[PDB]
Symmetry: D2
Subunit: 220 residues, 4 copies
């Protein structure tokens, strides 16, 4: 009833502004929604080289690519073909704050992603502006309903040079476009996002993501 | 030098709160040295706004604050070239807004390019339900962090029914010209009010009064 | 690096003294567990301050990461911290302003872990779910373990299930410190947790608690 | 007739534990409730010399001593002779968290303060454990009612050696012991606290505080 196919293309356009620097990044990728895997090639079309760590944008670069077991309601796959949208806040431990949105629509075998990303108050000597990030660590999103809306909260951490970490708290709210899509119960979503390759200045990046929903111990 | 006793304000805000895009124009006047400014606002697009207009109002210029002679006035020292600010508002129910302003001057007019984005406001909360009455008067705590003037504020919106809605504000302020000397720690008292509005806030008259001081016992 | 003297089956002796919103209480615990299976359980008895005027659940995460199953590719700080032991301190920040801090000093004698627990909580609203006892249980969660300023630290996004099927969020931060020199710090990893009140009397003066915890490295290898 | 006299004495005993270090501090002071001023001599009875910055304890060492104007209800002066108590959390930007409680009663011309202070999760290399604090900057408490209880929130900042600042957010709830003390409307309370003198290791400290409530601008 979704018309979500086992192999899907992804078409993404993101425009943003972090600390006054405007950028536009295009993505073209492919994914396996039922396998919870996606990858994409990204190109900074405007505003490169980015004066800040590319990693902070990468979670903005679609929970339709999360493997859901049968015992958990899969709000995202049930949201199609009309699609859904999300809004997120990323609160970093040094006061940097970003918000992002994405409206996901599907035409055929392609998801289209309209992504906006704005960040403010990153310290000049912090690891984001000084590009000291190495990767996001694997994380687990906590998904619950609040005020009739599916919401995901995650304790996230960017690995830095020296193997220090930089903490970020994210909150995302997810909203099906079509009315009456059934909200899931509380669950967890394991995430692992990775930049597989990049040019020296991150004007081109290959990004990979793997996400699996589960109900926690003892069952997972 | 740059800043005259009476001064005009031209503002354009583009925003998106909870996915609703809007554009608001502002034409105003103030007295920088008395720390008072007033502005007429017209929602040019996205009207009527589906959310509390009050959340936008602190984004609608610290050059309009009365600084006393004993405290360095970074804002007036930033002109003619001007300065910019970036702000996050973290509301107690998870709603978060970020805003930027780039302020420039030509002649007797300040030009404000304002952007405002808000996400994650709950549908039955006072913001989406428009249950706000006003920002309470507040005090900004101004300090330097990582070489940047920063202002933090414990803010509270009065709601219908006499409850309050808490927000924490952090603003960073940056002069465009290199070498503007940063102030030491100080406070800025703020009072913002909507003086009038039409029923759906497509037109609003806004007024703000701000005074910088060094706290007790000398304030 | 050395023999821990941690046996596959251990006893637990716990004494907690605390104050939440001005109400003092003392709670004693006797339990047993399997450190290598990451499972433990204990019978708790409120020794005074009973019956508690707040939700018992907020105390439960304070009632030992030595009971967590670690795979051998993740360094297990807690088991190596024995025989001498370790201590932790923790803050719980609840979404409505309630804030708790808690400390445990853990030692081992023979086949028994001894836990000296303190718990202090302030600013919970009178009509909030903690003070009105509207909580059902903690949801399963995942702690993110990492080294922060040279100290092993775990941060958790937690949520209490309430009556009416709402959730009440809490953020926890715990610092863990071995008592002896030479304990190797682990790299970033995750710890799945699930805690549950198995049974209780009407006023929670008596409670049976169980916990299961498993360490892992996240996707793709978990 | 009034329980609040123009010249009052203060008797205080604090017991605390910060980062596992236990301590007991006794305080003997005087103040002028109507002028919003008080001072106290403190002596560390147990656990001295303290291994952390004494300044973090100082706001725990009574809003009875705040000058309130006629047009703002003075909850604190109206709470006596029976008294009131407060509970507070101090959330420092580097993860240190302190909670404190004070139960204040009165006998004759003396206030009795039973204070408890606990802190956890201060980093070894941070300004509290390294004793790099110089003072609390002057601040303004925002006072409002929430769920029937008078609550005060403050954006606070410790000046550090080197002219940096260390941020702390505090929230305090205040509750009269008598039923029927009328809650105030929203208002502000300016505070300044200062250590007037101390011995090298802070085993003896003289502390002073001045507080004035007001309605904000325009008025004052
Ligand atoms: O993991 S549960 O069964 O406590």
């Amino acid at each position: 009833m979704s018309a979500i196919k086992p192999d899907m293309k992804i078409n993404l356009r993101m425009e943003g502004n972090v600390n006054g620097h405007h950028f536009v990044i295009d993505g073209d990728g492919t994914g396996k929604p039922f396998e919870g895997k996606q990858s994409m090639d990204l190109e900074v079309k405007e505003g490169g080289p980015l004066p800040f760590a590319f990693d902070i944008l990468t979670t903005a670069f679609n929970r339709v690519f999360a493997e859901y077991p049968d015992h958990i309601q899969d709000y995202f796959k049930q949201s199609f073909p009309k699609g859904y949208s999300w809004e997120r806040s990323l609160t970093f431990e040094d006061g940097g704050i970003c918000i992002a949105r994405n409206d996901i629509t599907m035409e055929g075998d392609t998801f289209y992603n309209k992504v906006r990303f704005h960040g403010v108050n990153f310290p000049a000597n912090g690891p984001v502006m000084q590009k000291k990030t190495l990767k996001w660590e694997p994380s687990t999103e906590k998904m619950y309903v609040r005020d009739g809306v599916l919401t995901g909260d995650i304790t996230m951490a960017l690995l830095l040079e020296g193997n220090a970490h930089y903490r970020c708290d994210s909150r995302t709210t997810y909203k099906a476009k079509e009315k009456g899509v059934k909200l899931p119960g509380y669950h967890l979503v394991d995430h692992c996002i990775e930049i597989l390759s990049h040019d020296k200045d991150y004007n081109k990046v290959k990004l990979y993501e793997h996400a699996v929903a589960h109900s926690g111990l003892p069952d997972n």
